[PDB]
Amino acid sequence: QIAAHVISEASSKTTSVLQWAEKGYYTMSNNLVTLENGKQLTVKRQGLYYIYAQVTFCSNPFIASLCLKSPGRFERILLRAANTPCGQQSIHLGGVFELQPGASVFVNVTDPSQVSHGTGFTSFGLLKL
């Protein structure tokens, strides 16, 4: 069975792209999915994947985005959710998408500083169907 579940970490850099860590409660033994550069999940096998994120952030429009990338292919949106305590809320994204070997999915946000990083807060993962 092919699945990764990965957890948020403060990005350090500039971008809208969230940075993730292999801090999960499961061991992706397989390698059929990998976390590259703490930014993206890259799969090795072609398939129908259920892909998800949860993004927890502080308020005071906020948009999370699940995107798809591949060598030779500009980034492309798969999913987007908008939202309008410390104002704290959650965006959840999830869907089925067909993925090819080498493909990567990643998450990006309008404001990375607003987001809450701990385990239990912001995650991102998938599982092959």
Ligand X SMILES: *[C@@H]1O[C@H](CO)[C@@H](O)[C@H](O)[C@H]1NC(C)=O
User: Which positions lie near a second copy, rule CB under 8 A?
Assistant: 1, 3-5, 24-25, 27, 29, 48, 50, 52, 54, 56, 59, 61, 63, 65-66, 68, 76-85, 87-98, 116, 118-121, 123, 125, 127, 129
109 binds, among ligand LKJ, a second copy, ligand X, none (CB under 5 to 8 A by kind): ligand X
Is 116 exposed, middle or buried, given 0-12, 13-18 or 19+ CB atoms closer than 10 A?
middle
Give residue 125's identity as a one-letter amino acid code. G
Question: In this structure, how many other beta carbons lie within 10 angstroms of the beta carbon of residue 10?
Answer: 11
Q: Is 16 in the site for ligand X (CB under 6 A)?
A: yes
Q: Is 108 in the site for ligand X (CB under 6 A)?
A: yes
56 binds, among a second copy, ligand LKJ, ligand X, none (CB under 5 to 8 A by kind): a second copy
CA dihedral 45, 97, 112, 57 (to 10 degrees): -120
Long-range pairs for 36-39: beta carbons < 8 A, 24 or more residues apart: 36/104, 38/9, 39/106
How remote is the C-alpha of 30 from its chain's centroid?
19
CB of 30 to a second copy, least distance (A): 10
Interface contacts to ligand X, rule CB under 6 A: 16, 63-65, 67, 75-77, 80, 108-110, 119
